[PDB]
Scaffold this active site. Sequence first.
Site, PDB file in Angstrom:
ATOM      1  N   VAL A  62       0.923  -1.134   0.000  1.00  0.00           N
ATOM      2  CA  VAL A  62       0.000   0.000   0.000  1.00  0.00           C
ATOM      3  C   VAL A  62       0.967   1.189   0.000  1.00  0.00           C
ATOM      4  CG1 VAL A  62      -1.781  -1.229   1.450  1.00  0.00           C
ATOM      5  CG2 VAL A  62      -0.132   0.408   2.492  1.00  0.00           C
ATOM      6  N   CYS A  63       0.680   2.160  -0.888  1.00  0.00           N
ATOM      7  CA  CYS A  63       1.375   3.438  -0.896  1.00  0.00           C
ATOM      8  C   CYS A  63       1.270   4.160   0.414  1.00  0.00           C
ATOM      9  CB  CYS A  63       0.704   4.385  -1.935  1.00  0.00           C
ATOM     10  SG  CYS A  63       1.575   4.642  -3.457  1.00  0.00           S
TER      11      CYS A  63
END
Lengths: 167, 165, 166, 165, 164, 165, 165, 164, 163, 167
Positions: F47-48
């Site tokens: 996940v960014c």
Amino acid sequence: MVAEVQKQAPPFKKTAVVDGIFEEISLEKYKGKYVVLAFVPLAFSFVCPTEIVAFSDAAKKFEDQGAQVLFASTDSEYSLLAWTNLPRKDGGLGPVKVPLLADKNHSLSRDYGVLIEKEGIALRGLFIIDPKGIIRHITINDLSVGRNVNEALRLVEGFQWTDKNGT
Amino acid sequence: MVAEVQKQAPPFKKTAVVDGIFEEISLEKYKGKYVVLAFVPLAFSFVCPTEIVAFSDAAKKFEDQGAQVLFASTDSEYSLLAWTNLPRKDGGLGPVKVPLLADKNHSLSRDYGVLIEKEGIALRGLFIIDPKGIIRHITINDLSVGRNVNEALRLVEGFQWTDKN
Amino acid sequence: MVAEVQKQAPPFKKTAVVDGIFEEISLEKYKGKYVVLAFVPLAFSFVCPTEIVAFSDAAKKFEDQGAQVLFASTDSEYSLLAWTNLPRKDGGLGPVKVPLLADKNHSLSRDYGVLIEKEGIALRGLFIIDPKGIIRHITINDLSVGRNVNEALRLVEGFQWTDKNG
Amino acid sequence: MVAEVQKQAPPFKKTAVVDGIFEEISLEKYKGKYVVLAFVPLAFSFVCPTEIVAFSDAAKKFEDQGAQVLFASTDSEYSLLAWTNLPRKDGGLGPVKVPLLADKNHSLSRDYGVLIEKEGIALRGLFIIDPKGIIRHITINDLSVGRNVNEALRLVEGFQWTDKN
Amino acid sequence: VAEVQKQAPPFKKTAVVDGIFEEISLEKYKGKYVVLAFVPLAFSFVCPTEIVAFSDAAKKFEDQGAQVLFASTDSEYSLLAWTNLPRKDGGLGPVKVPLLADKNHSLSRDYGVLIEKEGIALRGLFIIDPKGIIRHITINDLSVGRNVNEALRLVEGFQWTDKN
Amino acid sequence: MVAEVQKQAPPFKKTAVVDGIFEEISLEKYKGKYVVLAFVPLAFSFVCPTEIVAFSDAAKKFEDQGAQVLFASTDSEYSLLAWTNLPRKDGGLGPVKVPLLADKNHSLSRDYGVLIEKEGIALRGLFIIDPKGIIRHITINDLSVGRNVNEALRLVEGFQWTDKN
Amino acid sequence: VAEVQKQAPPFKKTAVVDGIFEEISLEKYKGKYVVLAFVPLAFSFVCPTEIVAFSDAAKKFEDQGAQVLFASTDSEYSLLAWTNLPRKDGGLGPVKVPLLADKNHSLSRDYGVLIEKEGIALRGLFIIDPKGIIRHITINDLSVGRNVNEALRLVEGFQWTDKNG
Amino acid sequence: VAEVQKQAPPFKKTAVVDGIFEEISLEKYKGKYVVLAFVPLAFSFVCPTEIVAFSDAAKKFEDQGAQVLFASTDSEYSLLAWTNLPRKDGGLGPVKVPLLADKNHSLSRDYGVLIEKEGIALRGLFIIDPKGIIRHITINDLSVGRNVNEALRLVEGFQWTDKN
Amino acid sequence: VAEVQKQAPPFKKTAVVDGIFEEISLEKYKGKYVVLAFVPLAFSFVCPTEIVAFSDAAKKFEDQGAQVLFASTDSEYSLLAWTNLPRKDGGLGPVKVPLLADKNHSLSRDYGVLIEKEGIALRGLFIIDPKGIIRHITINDLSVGRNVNEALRLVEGFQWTDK
Amino acid sequence: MVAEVQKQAPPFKKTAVVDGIFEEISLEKYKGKYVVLAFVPLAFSFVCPTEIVAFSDAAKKFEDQGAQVLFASTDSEYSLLAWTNLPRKDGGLGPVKVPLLADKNHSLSRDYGVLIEKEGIALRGLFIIDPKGIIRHITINDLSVGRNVNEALRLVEGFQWTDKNGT
């Protein structure tokens, strides 16, 4: 299971001396009759057994009232036997007309509330138990003073009368 | 704290009727004398109190022997008072020569082993207690049959004799 | 099993004096009617029983309201009987128009929360119990001061009205 | 810690509305005086508060008898305040001459035995508490029917008389 | 107690809906998002701009597939009177979201917002999805309010993620 | 033990990565300032980190509000260090302007109520703690959706304003 | 807990095998010897010569009928990143043995190597036979490592003894 | 309970010594070996040859620095009468060793020989040294007796070893 | 624990019989008298004259219908080595009675002879009848031994008057 | 009171054979030195003592490193003594340069987690304990396979080195 007036008497099955030989006595054996269970502290004691003799002599008056007298002590059946074989002239008890129950393991004396634990002997308790096994009377005397034979007869006659009327 | 032969009797302090008025009676009050504590199930019961009367009449014979008779029931001191004020002709007790103790909270009857919990009344127990407060005798009869006044006299005389010999 | 407003009243079966003889009274006997259970102990007390008399005299007003009054004490049925046989001139109660219940074993007084264990007597509690056996009111007075008969009538009338509207 | 006649009343310290503003009220504040503590289930309820009004109007008769009336409910002091600010013409309570105690956390109602746990509201209990803090009376009505102001006055007068004779 | 990722505690509470009482349960909104928000107290001296903001956005929530519900530890009668007392006169006026009376405190206790000593709920807000799972918890001290757009943003967020 | 609004925040002392090196961070260190404690599940996740970046970028806006932002995860300080040393072009976090706390033994996540025991990771909780160490706000999101930086600023400004008075 | 002569605690843990995730359990290696070895942290400031030595001997273990497994309390993402970071640059580089992510600590707890206060495993090594019985336990404090040849010697030892008698 | 190497359970029991009662405790023999021996019942149908053998060897024990004591669960009155009844007439006759009346069973219980169901002691024999430590235990079923010479041998044994 | 008149605690213990190991249980001797005797330690600086005396009388016991068994808290390997070390050289030499290795202490504990603090058995001896009932118990402190003839006398006694 | 790496080693005081005579050995006696405590299941077993001999021969290398090797078994000091008096030609152990501790009551083996309750013998555990009494290593082998003397030397040298540096 302690003994109380109005409650079921603690059952028992104890070896006893009856007419100089051993017999296993239980309360269930006398169901249908009154039983008068009476304790005495020790055999061969330095106290004259006039009390046991008085009840022995009245054996038949009890039988006529529909009752059986039983005596009981914390001595073995062998000590109690020897007590009967030693005549009264010679400081014993002589034969008697009521069973003598040997409560060596103390269960009887404990269940009837008369044992003096520290001492290993029963107080002079007397219990009258009716035909259905209910305790209708309790006397318990300290050792120094005895019981009255006529009281037991009076009470048994009393409870029979009341058994067969209103009260 | 139950009552047993050879043990100290359970102490008590109970309101009683003595000569038509209230007094607080304890056992400690009779230290030095024999006490004969006797219970009866109910006041005003439809059974003739011949038993209490026999012990009332012998009150003085006990006193002469150095003993005190005490009666006790689970009724209030007001019920017991009214019992004495109602004469025997009229189905009561009439006056009596022995304190009547009101065990309303049941502590006495419980400590002396005579209370019938389900019912709220005492069995006909009788206890003889010596001058040092030791229980030397216990009688307990079911309700149908009464006690003998002479037995209590005989026993008290017995325990006195043995106390001194 | 104590007594509380909104809860089922503790059941009972107690020997009582009704018109100079004994009868076994239970609450179940009055199912369908209001019951007004009121305690008093002691019988033969040196206090004038004006309270029981007031409720005895109003017996019929209660009956008209659909209610039965019951009195109760920790005295035996024999003490309570003798109380009624002893007239008022002579310091008793005289006869009465409401059953007198003998709570000798204290179970009733204990279940209703009025027993003074130390003393063996009931406080002056009064309970109104509806036809389904639910407690709709509780009064409990310390001993020095009595209850008002009209309060019990007012309350019963109150609970009937609300039973049939509300 | 439930409340019982003859026993010490459960102490309390609760925020109340007194004369349109908040004050912390405890029982200890009235030691020396009789206190008549009376509960109500709910503010703004669809039942006319004639009961609280009757006790409010008799405030001074209580004060003359040496007693203080206090009311209590499980509503917040803000709900109870708003109740007083909403006049009776408009379906509220209007001002009153007796403190209104906010039992929001239910401790008071629980300790006095009036809380209906499932519901969050107090039964219509009324307790009379003497100068030493002993409960001398308990009334508890189901919600449908109210209390009589004169009973509380009669009882307080009763307990004073007996306190002094 | 209520926890993110777990099933929300069920409830059935009497509420004020359009000036009359109705029994509201969570089960009633199964299939929709529910945004349960607490406030106690009614008639408090702090302006209810917060409840009004959520009342005014009622319809934006409904469009997002969500129902807003408010709750307090006051009785349905106190809450009713609150709505009947207009704002000019220091009350709340009507509102477009049910107001739940948590008088017995069960709701506030089960959702972890009750201040036991005090009898009132913190300003908690719970977002509960269509299967009844708690997907968000906010809890503010009483002094400061919540943002209506956060609840809309979060619900939109959880819908999006529900479908991808 | 657990964290609740209005109560004292659970104390902590945890090794953290600040500007590429380790420092021991406790809450007591920021007494007098607001602290905004925010948790994230794992480092190097797929996940960014736009959420941590948004808070990193607003570091100085928080400082101007009188607040310090702290981030926290159940990774070791070595994993978190490596995360910062790995730039974003290459799938990491790059450096950041807020301390990253290594809650390896899970005590922090447990005491703040965000640990998922079965999994060993923290939910996305965010706590605002005032200068006296009292928790004035709690947000906790399921993992799928992030937090809003402006909410934390708005709340901090809100609590300062209301603090004064 | 794990003991010599007893059945090894079962497990199922996400691991990095050849740069991707796979669920590894002990049951998977029934029939083979398993050499389970723990290491305290990824990206630690110690070059992991120990893991490399066991990685390089992977094939000698495979020839003996044994599988080596490594385990740490880091996430599979931290451990993955560890392998993606080459050794020139301070990481681990790829390896020929599964790396197990014990994030919730159950494995380290069940095998008796977790240091609760710290959140990391001691340098334990367990040899488990084809029936799943633990035939050896080594546990070193962190400062000093294990010998690859010892594990090979022991496995050869237990095979020999498995097949004579 | 009583165990080899441990302190023997103390006792104080009424006993028959030369036709009269005396209170016997273990503490009374501190400094000497004590050989405590139980027998199940007085006046039983089984010949007391065992008690007689130990009675006859009383003096050999005394010379070794030891005291023999016998013990039974009968009263001192039953035991007294047993001695007053001569052997010609089925009793025990006089004896040279105290006979201890364990009526309340404490002794037999503490020494591990009581048969609770029955109220009698097994035929246990315990040798206790001058410091009160149990150095030997024998316990025979009812059918078979003890050997007097074993007790003498053991006492001599423990004295010798006491001084080495 | 073991008591006269009660069933003896069962056992199954590795023993040295004629220089090799065999598993001995009490159940193996059901029908015969068993004389179980404990010894506290092998290679102790005290003489095994006691075990030798019972070993020499093995056959007298067998004639009476009885089996003698010895038991100690040593391993079967220590006990074996004890027999392999002759008496000239300070050991026991061979013996005509099983030597039971109570290494886990269960036997000594169940028979009431273990000295927990020490890990060794007192010199207890138990006679157990064909139905498995304990008909005798001797227990000596360590300094002084048992008499072989007593055990023979007792066994003959209990056989004669059976039960 | 079990033994764990990083925790204080269980104290002990056990009678041991040192140079053919008995001596009471406790851990407290070696405070300040490393101790290498090693267990073996049974004396006179049919397995050659090569392992004990290897550690006996390296006794002095350990002593030079500031460590003391101690062996321990659940046999009595008399069995262990006889084991040393029986030379190796004749199937025994012969003398040795390390104390042999008699854990007859099993307390040592229990506290160090190597006792096999059902069996009454210790597994082949080896514990390295530092000068402050902290356990820095645990090896435990099932009975079929032995330990390596050089491992114990390597580990002790390892822990000393690290005791006296940063790294």
